[PDB]
Design a protein around this ligand. Structure first.
Ligand code: CLA
Ligand code: CLA
Ligand code: CLA
Ligand code: CLA
Ligand code: CLA
Ligand code: CLA
Ligand code: CLA
Ligand code: CLA
Ligand code: CLA
Ligand SMILES: CC1=C(C/C=C(\C)CCC[C@H](C)CCC[C@H](C)CCCC(C)C)C(=O)c2ccccc2C1=O
Ligand code: SF4
Ligand code: SF4
Lengths: 141, 95, 157, 33, 153, 742, 80
């Protein structure tokens, strides 16, 4: 699927907190989540406090992926809205992150490939003596 | 547009969104008198070179420290005085 | 009376009456830590003078031989030693942070958003100038307060 | 000057050598080739 | 007289300990009226002390230089009553317990949810199983010979 | 309006739920798959907010549970009054309350424990108690074991009454949420009726019983030939001869001629010199005035009629200079969260317990309490520990509110949101002031140790050295020593004698509170106290504020209040939960209260408690060594811990052998706790699975599968044994020392 | 950063993915189980290491398996 192309949409009504983007946004990547709220309502944002998300499109810039996905799961489970967040490096190159196929990762969409997948039971891994003095570990054959 | 109503994600102006503002950095010009400034700029330039300042501070601090400790008479610090008392015997004679 | 930082409510701070008052923003902008336009050496001299002029107080009036005759004469040497420690500290900080020639890592723009010139203090040569200024001004202030403690008559601390 | 030698070396190993080692190892800690 | 220990009926330090404790009790007995109840309790404690020391005298306890009954647990018959005759009396009783609680665990092993009888003990079943461990040593012996003592996995 | 609002027979009284264990929840009312089931049964036993998700059933449960607790407290009181009746030397203590140790416990002579029955005095062999109950009973004018026996039967009656009341208010006729949620009536009644009329009726007891009997006992009277209280009520000539103010009657009261009632309701400040307690005339006037105060205070909130205040009406209309637009929604969270109310009430109840300790050591209200040094030490130590524990519980329940009973959607508050928003500023500045306090108190102690060890006592922080004098507390002592002459002229003497003056109320060969001086060591240890308190507040407030989300775990409220971790990721999240923060704040409350009671015991044993000679010079227990030894940690180790713990090692033999024993065992259990705090469940589960192999090899495999303790349960067992062992060590130490010296 | 390797004992219950707070995991089609799906792990560079994936894996020991490894700023749970 094509990504959703993060626009300059508005943000929630928040009075400011001490949970924002300190330096991991200035020099490293920071994150941004966008959700379409059917109505204006209050929600507990993951950086501490309580914001009021607006009707229609909302946009909230967060410091790490766990904040974004925690807020997204609370949105999808409590307000039942469809979230999708990105990762914006300090030079640009906004990376589409969460669904990665349009459908949520709990659904087995075709096309996504098997990466990080061993075709063996967990106790058939060789011992560390087999992979000693080799850059590989006991779980990468 | 960062200056819109509750828009804080202008992607080309990513310094205002990341929080790259100088909270207190004033670009106001030199406040000191230029002659005082020239005096300090000429008299402190020898300390500007870092690799020659680290070496200088090491070999000057260690020198002053190993010197002022050496020529410290027995009035500043008592470790260089001595016992200045008859040494008392230990338990069990001395052992 | 409290306001989110620069209007942006998702940066980790707040415009309070403590960090955003005009008295504070005048005080904390016109002191040598934030004189971003002047070269780092003069403001470093100011910082060193302000930190060496007072550091002699604790060493001279609370030192190990403050109650003896070498109270100021040794406390001032101790303060000069702490200045020679801290100039070394700033030196190794500037060496580990900024290597030799990179541009400034400082905040580029101001609060309003105008394209302020980057602070040269956060450069290698700039912080080196700041180290030299701190060392010179610190020994200067230590010796000046040593001069004043025995010249000028005070009831002391 | 042999009772003065502790006064030379105890600072030089205990104050000066620790400053040297701490500075040098802090530079080695933050170096980047 | 084994291990360089005089017997306690002959040890002077043992009698001195007796007299010291008795004087320590009598010095607390003077503060009370001779017919009062604290005084009678102290006197009962005094007779208890005296017959305790007499019984440690007559039962072959050995007293050291400190003057305290030492236990010779090696195997000398004269002192089996110090360790082995109690010890068997332990291994019986202890082996009663383990032979009971094991047998119970085998009797509630074949239930549907056998964990709700661990926390809620079947008192009839436990009372039937408790006296099975009276003569437990022959049951454990035979179950060792029959192989029923060790599970075969 | 405020109706009765109860329902009949909500829950059927039966033993069916006694049979099936763990009935109260979904995951426990199945049976034990493992042995963790038992621990989770007891852990969630009183977690009523987890059993049923409605405030009605929760509120009924906690109401009847409070009735059970009241039945237990009445049963315990019945026990104490009864042990004071039949197993005590209370008469012999009344005859000579200076050389007869208060004893109300006798042991059975079975295995040599009869030596714990000590020569306490009075022809009685028993355990010297330290609860000060004898002092309460002399403050009540008891003077007979019949009265203690009948009030013990009355407390048993009240225990049965409270148990029946809990049964009735759960199983037969239980209130519903409209009864609990109304709080204007609850406050009005608990103020005017519980605390107002309670103090009124206690003042009535004192005016009619305690004052005459205590005046007789102070004048010198055998408690057997003392007139009974009902003789003071009925025979007017008797009480009138005690106080002629009674001869006029209540026409002094109703004509507002109270000036003639100043024979038995005096404002006589200070302590009673004859007995060392406070003046019971002053205490009767106190409880009377407190009754008037709480009676006019309990008519403040609007319940059913037009007059009064609405707590909602107050809080939603309380604008002010600093965030007064808030305070809206607090009536919602406090009337819909038992955990919020439990947190607030525990905070203030524990702080009141600490206030109680601090005001009972210094203004000893009972007669012959100040000279029973075991009673004073035990009371201060006890109520200090109780206050610290209750404050740490305030933390736990603030956290449980923050996780479970916090919904910004429905129940929103401006102030709590503003606190959660800048919570990092809170915890950062509190961490800073904790570091600052740790340095400029304990580092002062370390400087003192180093200087005294380097032979530089001129460089220490002491009175004979660099002086850090508490100028502010010294100024307060100077004022309150001079307060009753100018600022409070109604008082003939100061409220307390800890301030200053030529006042030393000795009752016998014992001091009872001379003026406590404040030197450099008192500055140092008070800043240690501020330090330990600030670190406890750091840990606890941090767990409270970060109970929901953080920069580390932004979904912590979904993990729960009481969870171990969120795995070794993010570097590690081992003690990230708010439960883990109260678990650490328990250790810091322990450190805080232990150094508090150490300060107390040493300061009193060095500067206050002692003997008074026939020449008029006081000889203290330790001998005034607090100003010179309590500046160094070596002095606390030497002049306090090593020196005062001589009576607990020489305790063996004399009655105090138990205190000797409870020393070492307490020393053990503390260390036994270190098996739990240091370790982790994985090692113990693997050891247990090896032992389970050893059990499968003998057909003795259990069906309740042996599992190592939960991680949170390992931490709970650890902090539990740690507090028990440390506190019992200190209890044995304190009681042995102070019963063997004063 | 970390190394979240999964094994073929997975049954396709989709609980490891529904517990993952960083979208490391995602169900793919597969033919080795009744549910005909298995849980891949493309975004291992986003893994914090919280092991909620394997505290929700209902196998005899485990199918999803987190091996802690080189810790980056994303794997050290750092918002700064
Ligand atoms: C003993 C510690 C000490 C002391 C007394 C000083 C004192 C001073 N410093 Mg130095 N400084 C210190 C440690 C210290 N510094 C350290 C550890 C650093 C490294 C970060 C610096 C770095 C530094 C710089 C870069 C500069 C100073 C400057 C100054 C001067 C003015 C600014 C100021 O102090 O207020 C400002 C104080 C703060 C911002 C701290 C926060 C305090 C909060 C707001 C307290 C709560 C207040 C509340 C309303 C009540 C003053 C002489 C300036 C100078 O030289 O001026 C001539 C300057 O440019 N300092
Ligand atoms: C340990 C604390 C301490 C002590 C003992 C002293 C002691 C002294 N100070 Mg210093 N001072 C201190 C902290 C201290 N100061 C701090 C924290 C500041 C703020 C940065 C100052 C700022 C200060 C100034 C500005 C001056 C002194 C001066 C003095 C001297 C007379 C007053 C005396 C030696 C005076 C002096 O001339 O020193 C010789 C003087 O002019 N002090
Ligand atoms: C932390 C508590 C503490 C304190 C208060 C002291 C205090 C002192 N020590 Mg001790 N010491 C301590 C801990 C402490 N020590 C510990 C823990 C150890 C062993 C590990 C020692 C071991 C020790 C030795 C062996 C010796 C001392 C000595 C001294 C004295 C001289 C210190 C010195 O050189 O001045 C230098 C002091 C400074 C540079 C302090 C500057 C701080 C300024 C005042 C802060 C101002 C902040 C300001 C208010 C900020 C806001 C305003 C701003 C915005 C402008 C002094 C009395 C010496 C002695 O014997 O003399 C009596 C000595 O020989 N100390
Ligand atoms: C590992 C072995 C060892 C150890 C633990 C010490 C320990 C010490 N030495 Mg010795 N020393 C050693 C080997 C050692 N020395 C050797 C091999 C030499 C001959 C080069 C010396 C020559 C020496 C002198 C001349 C002095 C000490 C001193 C000291 C003390 C302060 C540290 C400085 O020293 C400096 C360390 C070196 C020169 C070793 C370099 C290798 C300390 C007790 C001082 C003293 O006596 O204090 C009381 C002092 O003045 N050391
Ligand atoms: C004998 C009379 C009786 C009977 C048959 C019942 C029967 C029942 N009650 Mg009721 N109840 C009673 C008296 C009775 N109750 C009284 C007197 C009170 C007031 C305290 C209550 C208060 C009460 C509440 C608040 C609740 C129940 C509930 C229940 C049900 C569950 C019982 C259970 O599993 O707990 C059995 C538990 C025990 C036997 C433990 C006894 C604990 C006592 C009170 C304290 C003892 C503490 C001890 C002194 C300290 C420990 C010392 C130790 C370390 C040595 C069941 C229908 C629950 C219910 O139906 O809700 C779902 C419920 O929530 N009861
Ligand atoms: C907090 C409550 C409390 C506590 C801790 C005690 C504790 C004690 N009581 Mg007391 N008692 C209490 C309440 C309490 N009692 C009440 C409410 C009554 C009135 C019924 C009594 C009536 C009472 C009598 C009549 C006696 C005790 C005795 C005892 C002792 C041994 C009891 C024993 O082993 O029982 C046996 C164990 C079980 C029943 C189980 C012990 C010191 C005995 C004692 O002190 O002997 C000298 C004794 O004779 N108690
Ligand atoms: C003026 C009347 C009055 C009085 C005296 C009290 C007193 C008390 N209430 Mg309150 N309460 C009142 C009115 C009153 N309440 C009203 C109107 C409501 C509804 C809004 C409540 C709702 C309420 C709750 C929800 C709870 C209490 C609790 C308590 C007890 C707290 C424990 C304590 O301090 O122990 C001091 C102990 C005593 C003074 C001993 C008590 C002995 C007497 C017999 C009972 C007090 C009178 C009482 C109201 C019963 C009246 C007669 C009854 C037959 C109807 C205390 C006994 C708590 C408690 O402990 O639960 C049981 C609790 O959870 N009350
Ligand atoms: C008014 C007082 C009060 C009240 C009503 C409550 C009520 C509650 N607390 Mg809170 N709490 C309090 C005080 C209070 N607590 C204090 C003072 C502290 C500080 C220690 C705490 C700390 C605390 C924590 C940290 C937690 C609770 C939890 C709970 C809930 C369940 C407790 C449970 O089921 O355990 C039932 C009872 C037990 C398991 C018995 C505990 C055994 C104690 C600790 C041993 C000590 C006994 C004795 C002194 C030692 C000698 C014993 C001897 C036999 C050897 C319940 C809502 C839990 C909760 O809500 O989590 C969801 C929870 O995690 N509380
Ligand atoms: C004696 C044991 C000990 C010590 C020294 C500490 C020390 C500390 N704890 Mg810890 N803690 C301990 C046991 C201890 N803890 C235990 C057993 C627990 C069990 C639960 C905890 C739990 C715990 C928690 C949960 C918290 C702390 C906190 C703190 C800090 C508060 C004080 C502070 O920083 O002031 C200054 C430092 C001290 C007072 C420590 C002693 C240093 C002395 C004064 C002298 C220093 C000399 C100097 C630096 C020279 C060094 C030598 C040189 C060669 C470099 C500090 C790091 C709090 C914290 O970190 O936040 C503020 C906090 O929240 N602790
Ligand atoms: C010692 C220890 C254990 C092992 C502790 C055990 C499993 C708990 C103690 C259980 C008791 C001994 C069970 C026996 C009591 C039964 C009720 C049986 C009674 C029958 C007779 C024994 C009377 C942990 O599981 C643990 C977990 C996490 C951190 C630290 C630790 C830790 O330190
Ligand atoms: S060590 Fe224990 S508490 Fe820490 S992360 Fe691992 S499981 Fe969690
Ligand atoms: S939790 Fe385990 S079994 Fe379930 S989908 Fe993930 S890997 Fe497969």
């Amino acid at each position: 699927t094509p990504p959703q192309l993060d626009p300059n949409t508005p943000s929630p009504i928040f009075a400011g907190s001490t949970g924002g983007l300190l330096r991991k946004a200035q020099v490293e990547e920071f994150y941004v989540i966008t959700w379409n709220s059917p109505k204006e309502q209050i929600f507990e944002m993951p950086t501490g406090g309580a914001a009021i998300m607006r009707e229609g499109p909302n946009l909230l810039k967060l410091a790490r992926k766990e904040q974004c996905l925690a807020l997204g799961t609370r949105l999808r489970s409590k307000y039942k809205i469809t979230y999708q967040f990105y990762r914006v490096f300090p030079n640009g190159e906004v990376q589409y992150l969460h669904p990665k196929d349009g459908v949520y990762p709990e659904k087995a969409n075709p096309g996504r490939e098997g990466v990080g997948l061993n075709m063996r039971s967990i106790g058939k891994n060789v011992s560390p003596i087999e992979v000693k003095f080799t850059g590989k570990q006991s779980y990468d054959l | 547009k960062y200056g819109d109503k509750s828009v804080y994600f202008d992607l080309e102006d990513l310094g205002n969104t990341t929080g790259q503002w100088d909270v207190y950095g004033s670009d106001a010009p030199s406040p000191y008198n230029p002659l005082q400034s020239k005096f300090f700029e000429t008299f402190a330039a020898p300390f500007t070179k870092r690799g020659l300042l680290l070496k200088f501070l090491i070999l000057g601090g260690g020198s002053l420290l190993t010197y002022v400790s050496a020529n410290s008479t027995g009035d500043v610090l008592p470790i260089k005085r001595g016992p200045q008392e008859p040494p008392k015997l230990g338990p069990r004679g001395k052992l | 009376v409290v306001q989110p930082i620069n209007g942006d409510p998702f940066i980790g701070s707040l415009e309070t009456p403590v960090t955003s008052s005009p008295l504070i923003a005048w005080y904390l902008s016109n002191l040598p830590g934030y004189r971003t336009a002047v070269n780092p050496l003069l403001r470093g001299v100011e910082v060193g003078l302000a930190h060496g002029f007072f550091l002699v107080g604790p060493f001279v009036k609370a030192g190990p031989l403050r109650n003896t005759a070498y109270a100021g004469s040794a406390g001032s040497l101790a303060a000069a030693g702490l200045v020679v420690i801290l100039s070394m500290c700033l030196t190794i900080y500037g060496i580990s942070s900024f290597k030799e020639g990179e541009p400034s890592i400082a905040p580029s723009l101001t609060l309003t958003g105008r394209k302020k010139q980057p602070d040269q203090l956060q450069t290698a040569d700039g912080w080196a100038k700041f180290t030299g200024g701190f060392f010179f001004g610190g020994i200067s202030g230590v010796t000046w307060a040593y001069f004043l403690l025995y010249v000028l008559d005070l009831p002391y601390f | 000057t042999f009772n003065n030698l502790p006064s030379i070396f105890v600072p030089l190993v205990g104050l000066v050598f620790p400053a040297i080692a701490m500075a040098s190892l802090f530079l080695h800690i933050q170096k980047n080739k | 007289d084994i291990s360089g220990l005089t017997p306690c009926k002959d040890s002077k330090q043992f009698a001195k300990r007796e007299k010291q404790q008795i004087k320590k009790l009598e010095s607390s007995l003077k503060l009370y009226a001779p017919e009062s109840a604290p005084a009678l309790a102290l006197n009962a404690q005094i007779e208890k002390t005296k017959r305790r020391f007499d019984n440690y005298g007559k039962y072959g306890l050995l007293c050291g230089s400190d003057g305290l009954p030492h236990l010779i647990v090696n195997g000398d018959q004269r002192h089996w009553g110090e360790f082995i005759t109690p010890g068997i009396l332990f291994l019986y009783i202890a082996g009663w317990i383990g032979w009971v609680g094991r047998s119970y665990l085998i009797a509630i092993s074949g239930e549907k949810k056998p964990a709700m009888k661990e926390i809620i003990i079947d008192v009839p079943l436990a009372s039937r199983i408790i006296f099975r461990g009276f003569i437990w040593p022959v049951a454990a012996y035979r179950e060792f010979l029959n192989g029923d003592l060790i599970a075969k996995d | 309006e405020v109706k009765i609002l109860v329902d009949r027979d909500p829950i059927k009284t039966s033993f069916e739920e006694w049979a099936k264990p763990g009935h109260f929840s979904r995951t426990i009312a199945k049976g034990p798959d493992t042995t963790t089931w038992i621990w989770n049964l007891h852990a969630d036993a009183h977690d009523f907010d987890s059993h049923t998700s409605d405030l009605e059933e929760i509120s009924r449960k906690v109401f009847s549970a409070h009735f059970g607790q009241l039945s237990i407290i009445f049963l315990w009181l019945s026990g104490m009054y009864f042990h004071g009746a039949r197993f005590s030397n209370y008469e012999a203590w009344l005859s000579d309350p200076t050389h007869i140790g208060p004893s109300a416990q006798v042991v059975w002579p079975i295995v040599g424990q009869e030596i714990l029955n000590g020569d306490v005095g009075g022809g009685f062999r028993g355990i010297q108690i330290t609860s000060g109950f004898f002092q309460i009973w002399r403050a009540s004018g008891i003077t007979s074991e019949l009265q203690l026996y009948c009030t013990a039967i009355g407390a048993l009656v009240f225990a049965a009454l409270m148990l029946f009341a809990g049964w009735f208010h759960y199983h037969k006729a239980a209130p519903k949420l409209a009864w609990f949620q109304d709080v204007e009536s609850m406050l009005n009644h608990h103020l005017a009726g519980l605390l107002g009329l309670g103090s009124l009726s206690w003042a009535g007891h004192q005016v009619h019983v305690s004052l005459p009997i205590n005046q007789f006992l102070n004048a010198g009277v055998d408690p057997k030939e003392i007139p009974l209280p009902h003789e003071f009520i009925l025979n007017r000539d008797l009480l009138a001869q005690l106080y002629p103010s009674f001869a006029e009657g209540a026409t002094p009261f109703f004509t507002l001629n109270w000036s003639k009632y100043s024979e038995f309701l005096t404002f006589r400040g200070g302590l009673d010199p004859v007995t060392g307690g406070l003046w019971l005339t002053d205490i009767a006037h106190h409880h009377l005035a407190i009754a008037i105060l709480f009676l006019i205070a309990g008519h403040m909130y609007r319940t059913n009629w037009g007059i009064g205040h609405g707590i909602k009406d107050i809080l939603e209309a309380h604008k002010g200079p600093f965030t007064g637009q808030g305070h809206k929604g607090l009536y919602e969270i406090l009337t819909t969260s038992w955990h919020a109310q439990l947190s607030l009430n525990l905070a203030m109840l524990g702080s009141l317990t600490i206030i109680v300790a601090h005001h009972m050591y210094s203004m000893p209200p009972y007669p012959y309490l100040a000279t029973d040094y075991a009673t004073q030490l035990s009371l201060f130590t006890h109520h200090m520990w109780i206050g610290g524990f209750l404050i740490v519980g305030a933390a736990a329940h603030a956290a449980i509110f923050m996780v479970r009973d916090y919904d910004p959607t429905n129940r929103y508050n401006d102030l709590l949101d503003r606190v959660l928003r800048h919570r990092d500023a809170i915890i950062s500045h509190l961490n800073w002031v904790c570091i600052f306090l740790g340095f400029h108190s304990f580092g002062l102690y370390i400087h003192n140790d180093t200087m005294s060890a380097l032979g530089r006592p001129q460089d220490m922080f002491s009175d004979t050295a660099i002086q850090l004098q508490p100028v502010f507390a010294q100024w307060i002592q100077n004022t309150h020593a001079l307060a009753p002459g100018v600022t409070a002229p109604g008082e003939t003497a100061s409220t307390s004698l800890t301030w200053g003056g030529g006042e030393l109320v000795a009752v016998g060969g014992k001091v009872a509170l001379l003026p406590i001086p404040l030197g450099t060591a008192d500055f140092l240890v008070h800043h240690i106290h501020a330090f330990t308190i600030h670190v406890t507040v750091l840990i606890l407030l941090k767990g409270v504020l970060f109970a929901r989300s953080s920069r580390l775990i932004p979904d912590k409220a979904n993990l729960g209040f009481r969870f171990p971790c969120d795995g070794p990721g993010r570097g590690g999240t081992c003690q990230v939960s708010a439960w883990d923060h109260v678990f650490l704040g328990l250790f810091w409350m322990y450190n805080a209260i232990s150094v508090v009671i150490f300060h107390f015991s040493w300061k009193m044993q060095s500067d206050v408690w002692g003997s008074i000679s026939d020449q008029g010079v006081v000889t203290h227990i330790t001998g005034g060594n607090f100003a010179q030894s309590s500046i160094t940690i070596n002095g606390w180790l030497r002049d306090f811990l090593w020196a005062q713990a001589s009576q607990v090692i020489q305790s063996y033999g004399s009655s105090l052998s138990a205190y000797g024993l409870f020393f070492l065992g307490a020393h053990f259990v503390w260390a036994f706790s270190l098996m739990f705090l240091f370790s982790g469940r994985g090692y113990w589960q693997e050891l247990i699975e090896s032992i389970v192999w050893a059990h499968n090899k003998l057909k003795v495999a259990p069906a309740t599968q042996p599992r190592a303790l939960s991680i949170i349960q390992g931490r709970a067992v650890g902090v539990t044994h740690y507090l028990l062992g440390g506190i019992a060590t200190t209890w044995a130490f304190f009681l042995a020392r102070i019963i063997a010296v004063g | 950063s970390h190394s979240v390797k999964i094994y073929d004992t997975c049954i396709g219950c989709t609980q490891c993915v529904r517990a993952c707070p960083t979208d490391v995991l995602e169900m793919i089609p597969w033919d080795g189980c009744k549910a005909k799906q298995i849980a891949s792990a493309p975004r291992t560079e986003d893994c914090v290491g919280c092991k909620r994936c394997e505290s929700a894996c209902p196998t005899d020991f485990l199918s999803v398996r987190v091996y802690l490894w080189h810790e980056t700023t994303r794997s050290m749970g750092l918002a700064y």
